[PDB]
């Protein structure tokens, strides 16, 4: 199952190519400007087989609770209404979001005690690195 090392409170320390990733998602200009300024805290927790990923920022909070491999309706930070699935592939916690015939993936893996979120849309690769608080 998901490594217990994912559990805890994480703070964004670096974000690469997030503007282009948001653009590829169809996020508008004013929203991108705020999104590039956000320094979110991500809290990953579990209750039994239900994993929760909570994102906290001044601009927007989100929260998803899911079971591995079971599709769920998600409301994203930019208010897309998606059908999403989180899976585990060789230790990586992989989220796929599908809406309006489009798709994006967010793969979260632990590297050097940090959590690295790789976000991909239309060939944009965005990397967001978090350190444990
Ligand atoms: C909620 C924090 C970001 C604020 C900006 C909201 C508008 C666009 C965000 C859409 C995609 C967010 C993906 C974040 C991936 C991660 O956990 O690093
Ligand atoms: Cl913030």
Swiss-Prot record:
<comment type="subunit">
    <text>Monomer.</text>
</comment>
<feature type="binding site">
    <location>
        <position position="108"/>
    </location>
    <ligand>
        <name>hexadecanoate</name>
    </ligand>
</feature>
<feature type="binding site">
    <location>
        <begin position="128"/>
        <end position="130"/>
    </location>
    <ligand>
        <name>hexadecanoate</name>
    </ligand>
</feature>
<keyword id="KW-0813">Transport</keyword>
<dbReference type="InterPro" id="IPR000566">
    <property type="entry name" value="Lipocln_cytosolic_FA-bd_dom"/>
</dbReference>
<feature type="disulfide bond">
    <location>
        <begin position="119"/>
        <end position="126"/>
    </location>
</feature>
<dbReference type="GO" id="GO:0061024">
    <property type="term" value="P:membrane organization"/>
</dbReference>
<dbReference type="GO" id="GO:0005504">
    <property type="term" value="F:fatty acid binding"/>
</dbReference>
<keyword id="KW-0144">Charcot-Marie-Tooth disease</keyword>
<dbReference type="InterPro" id="IPR000463">
    <property type="entry name" value="Fatty_acid-bd"/>
</dbReference>
<feature type="binding site">
    <location>
        <position position="108"/>
    </location>
    <ligand>
        <name>(9Z)-octadecenoate</name>
    </ligand>
</feature>
<dbReference type="Pfam" id="PF00061">
    <property type="entry name" value="Lipocalin"/>
</dbReference>
<keyword id="KW-0963">Cytoplasm</keyword>
<keyword id="KW-0007">Acetylation</keyword>
<feature type="modified residue" description="N-acetylserine">
    <location>
        <position position="3"/>
    </location>
</feature>
<comment type="function">
    <text>May play a role in lipid transport protein in Schwann cells. May bind cholesterol.</text>
</comment>
<dbReference type="InterPro" id="IPR012674">
    <property type="entry name" value="Calycin"/>
</dbReference>
<keyword id="KW-0523">Neurodegeneration</keyword>
<keyword id="KW-0622">Neuropathy</keyword>
<dbReference type="GO" id="GO:0015485">
    <property type="term" value="F:cholesterol binding"/>
</dbReference>
<dbReference type="GO" id="GO:0043209">
    <property type="term" value="C:myelin sheath"/>
</dbReference>
<feature type="binding site">
    <location>
        <begin position="128"/>
        <end position="130"/>
    </location>
    <ligand>
        <name>(9Z)-octadecenoate</name>
    </ligand>
</feature>
<dbReference type="InterPro" id="IPR031259">
    <property type="entry name" value="ILBP"/>
</dbReference>
<keyword id="KW-0225">Disease variant</keyword>
<dbReference type="GO" id="GO:0005829">
    <property type="term" value="C:cytosol"/>
</dbReference>
<keyword id="KW-0446">Lipid-binding</keyword>
<comment type="similarity">
    <text>Belongs to the calycin superfamily. Fatty-acid binding protein (FABP) family.</text>
</comment>
<dbReference type="GO" id="GO:0015908">
    <property type="term" value="P:fatty acid transport"/>
</dbReference>
<keyword id="KW-1015">Disulfide bond</keyword>
<dbReference type="GO" id="GO:0070062">
    <property type="term" value="C:extracellular exosome"/>
</dbReference>
<dbReference type="GO" id="GO:0005634">
    <property type="term" value="C:nucleus"/>
</dbReference>
<dbReference type="InterPro" id="IPR031256">
    <property type="entry name" value="Myelin_P2"/>
</dbReference>
<protein>
    <recommendedName>
        <fullName>Myelin P2 protein</fullName>
    </recommendedName>
</protein>
